[PDB]
Amino acid sequence: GAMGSMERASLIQKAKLAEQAERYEDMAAFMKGAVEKGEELSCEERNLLSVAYKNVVGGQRAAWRVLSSIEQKSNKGPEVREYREKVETELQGVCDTVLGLLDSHLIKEAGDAESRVFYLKMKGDYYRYLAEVATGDDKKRIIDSARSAYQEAMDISKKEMPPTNPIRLGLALNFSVFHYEIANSPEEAISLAKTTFDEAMADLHTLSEDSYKDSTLIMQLLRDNLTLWT
Amino acid sequence: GAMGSMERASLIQKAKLAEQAERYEDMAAFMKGAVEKGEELSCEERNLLSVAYKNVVGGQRAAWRVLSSIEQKSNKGPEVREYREKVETELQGVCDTVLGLLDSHLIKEAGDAESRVFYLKMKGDYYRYLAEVATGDDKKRIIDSARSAYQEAMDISKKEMPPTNPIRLGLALNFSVFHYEIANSPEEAISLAKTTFDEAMADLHTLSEDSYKDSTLIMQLLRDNLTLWT
Amino acid sequence: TPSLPTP
Amino acid sequence: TPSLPTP
Numbered sequence: 001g002a003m004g005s006m007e008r009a010s011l012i013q014k015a016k017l018a019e020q021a022e023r024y025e026d027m028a029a030f031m032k033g034a035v036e037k038g039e040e041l042s043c044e045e046r047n048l049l050s051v052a053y054k055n056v057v058g059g060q061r062a063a064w065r066v067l068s069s070i071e072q073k074s075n076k077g078p079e080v081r082e083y084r085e086k087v088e089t090e091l092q093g094v095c096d097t098v099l100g101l102l103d104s105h106l107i108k109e110a111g112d113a114e115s116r117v118f119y120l121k122m123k124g125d126y127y128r129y130l131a132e133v134a135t136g137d138d139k140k141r142i143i144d145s146a147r148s149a150y151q152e153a154m155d156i157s158k159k160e161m162p163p164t165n166p167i168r169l170g171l172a173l174n175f176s177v178f179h180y181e182i183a184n185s186p187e188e189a190i191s192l193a194k195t196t197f198d199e200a201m202a203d204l205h206t207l208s209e210d211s212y213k214d215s216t217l218i219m220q221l222l223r224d225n226l227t228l229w230t
Numbered sequence: 231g232a233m234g235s236m237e238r239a240s241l242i243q244k245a246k247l248a249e250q251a252e253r254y255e256d257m258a259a260f261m262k263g264a265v266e267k268g269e270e271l272s273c274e275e276r277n278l279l280s281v282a283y284k285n286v287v288g289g290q291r292a293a294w295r296v297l298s299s300i301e302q303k304s305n306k307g308p309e310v311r312e313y314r315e316k317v318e319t320e321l322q323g324v325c326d327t328v329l330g331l332l333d334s335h336l337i338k339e340a341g342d343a344e345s346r347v348f349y350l351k352m353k354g355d356y357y358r359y360l361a362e363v364a365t366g367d368d369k370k371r372i373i374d375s376a377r378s379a380y381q382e383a384m385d386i387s388k389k390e391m392p393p394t395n396p397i398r399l400g401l402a403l404n405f406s407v408f409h410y411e412i413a414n415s416p417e418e419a420i421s422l423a424k425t426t427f428d429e430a431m432a433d434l435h436t437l438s439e440d441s442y443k444d445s446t447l448i449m450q451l452l453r454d455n456l457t458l459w460t
Numbered sequence: 461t462p463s464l465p466t467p
Numbered sequence: 468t469p470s471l472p473t474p
């Protein structure tokens with residue numbers, strides 16, 4: 001709504017300025033405005049959208065975990081629960097906003113593997129964040145929504161992208177985290193990380209120096225998780 | 231307004247939770263609500279108010295400096311200026327909010343030296359932040375408002391507080407920064423820091439170990455600035 | 461556990 | 468120049 005009067009190019013320009021200023025709420029609002037212009041996003045623009053919202057929700061999640069820990073230790077008056085609930089509702093609202101952008105209409109217009117995988121990974125991630133705070137009748141459905149998004153992304157990535165593609169790698173990293181932290185499936189998490197790492201290692205020989213650097217950065221995160229989990 | 235229905239004690243409790251969660255915007259809103267209950271603030275509460283707003287405006291100022299630097303290098307379309315202006319207006323609004331709390335009615339009800347000095351120091355600081363971004367007809371008046379607040383605080387502190395009092399020290403630190411960065415008076419800045427440091431050093435013998443630690447922490451900041459400035 | 465970081 | 472920090 002509020003960004004409706006600003007040029008798409010100006011919104012993208014201001015998102016980049018907001019990133020430099022570490023103003024991630026502004027960054028996200030600018031990128032939401034850009035998405036709502038109705039055009040497909042380029043690779044760079046997709047990454048600006050992702051950075052903005054991941055920083056916003058990352059702060060919310062960190063706050064939620066602090067407050068949830070205090071609340072758990074408490075089990076005084078209603079204030080800890082109320083404030084945890086306030087942060088939770090704000091986080092849920094941001095996740096619903098991102099999911100709404102993906103559904104209206106980024107995913108449906110995304111035909112190339114790179115864009116479709118990127119958006120489905122995001123869909124998995126934001127349902128995952130919803131799952132982290134879920135306790136009601138729809139919690140299993142939230143978890144399944146994350147799983148379904150990640151699984152569609154995985155199926156396309158395996159068919160259409162090399163094993164070293166950074167999006168394919170990051171998707172596998174995050175789906176492995178889903179398995180370990182949300183689905184109570186540590187063995188699946190470990191298997192996925194290990195297979196991803198090994199298949200990427202075997203394809204590094206095909207890469208330029210710059211691509212190598214990108215792929216190996218994410219492989220190291222896989223390895224770091226495998227080290228933590230084993 | 232929005233915190234009008236919450237108990238004062240609950241607002242203070244939630245400000246502390248917000249601090250632990252690094253949710254400083256929430257912290258500031260909670261403390262604004264507490265101030266608006268109309269009662270005087272205790273020492274601890276005064277410090278919660280200060281921490282909350284200093285974190286909020288500190289982020290805004292950092293963003294403003296990033297954007298102002300980009301704008302200066304640019305001198306492309308209006309977007310850098312517009313977004314710098316947007317951050318500036320938000321910063322001005324936060325400063326006006328704090329100044330409004332001080333004027334309605336924290337300062338007038340503050341009779342003890344410790345509270346009155348604390349609030350007048352805050353008044354100087356927030357006019358100082360207004361001065362950092364000021365360019366219009368009232369810029370000299372903004373600078374003088376900062377100066378006047380700091381000077382009243384200094385006069386009370388010198389009469390009523392020992393030279394090692396942390397508020398007296400922090401006031402001198404910030405007034406010295408005012409002189410160096412805003413009033414184009416580096417010699418006054420250096421004199422103030424040096425005299426403050428030396429008079430505090432001579433009074434350290436009177437302190438407990440815990441008071442000593444507090445006073446010396448701020449003395450070291452004075453010394454650090456003197457080292458930078460000379 | 462760590463997921464993909466932001467830059 | 469640095470002013471008084473926040474905790």
Ligand SMILES: *Cc1ccc(-n2c(-c3ccc(OCCO)cc3)nc3ccccc32)cc1Br
Pocket residue numbers: 043047050121166167168169170171214215217218221464465
């Ligand atoms: C989910 C996702 C995966 C990959 C990329 N991405 C990267 C890239 C991201 C992070 C990296 O390491 C992090 C730890 O050091 C390494 C590479 N490079 C890309 C190029 C093109 C498109 C996407 C890319 C982004 C994201 Br959001």
Ligand SMILES: *Cc1ccc(-n2c(-c3ccc(OCCO)cc3)nc3ccccc32)cc1Br
Pocket residue numbers: 273277280351396397398399400401444445447448451471472
């Ligand atoms: C403006 C102001 C001055 C002093 C205090 N303050 C302190 C205190 C603040 C910061 C310190 O060091 C910072 C660098 O390490 C050391 C001490 N201690 C206090 C006790 C009681 C009242 C105020 C106090 C706060 C502020 Br906002």
